[PDB]
Symmetry: C2
Subunit: 68 residues, 2 copies
């Protein structure tokens, strides 16, 4: 039990990650087809929010005993 695992972070990674993924595939499949093809935009966005959310979810509620 390193961190108290609050809800001020889990909501950011959960809501931020999920929402992003969706709004991303949409903003790219609807507003991304104009830019280039629709993979670089939604793709780069997913990868970003992905690595970020992960690092945050760990620093907030790392899988310590999650896999003891």
């Amino acid at each position: 039990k390193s961190q108290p695992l609050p809800l001020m972070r889990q909501v950011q990674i959960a809501a931020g990650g999920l929402i992003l993924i969706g709004v991303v595939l949409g903003y790219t499949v609807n507003s991304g087809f104009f830019l280039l093809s629709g993979f670089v935009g939604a793709g780069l966005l997913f990868a970003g929010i992905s690595g970020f959310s992960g690092m945050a979810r760990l620093l907030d509620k790392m899988p310590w005993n999650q896999r003891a």
Copy 2:
């Protein structure tokens, strides 16, 4: 100096908030005009990630001495 104010979260709230806002205004102004009008979607999304990111940014790097 309550918290060390890391960057594992500051990146999620900063990048997540900014990106979300943009990807939202687009996914709604392009893929939202189909749903209803294009305000309920992008709007609810903005407010959501807004209050969330804020609560997180504060719980991590609250404006303690920021305005002492």
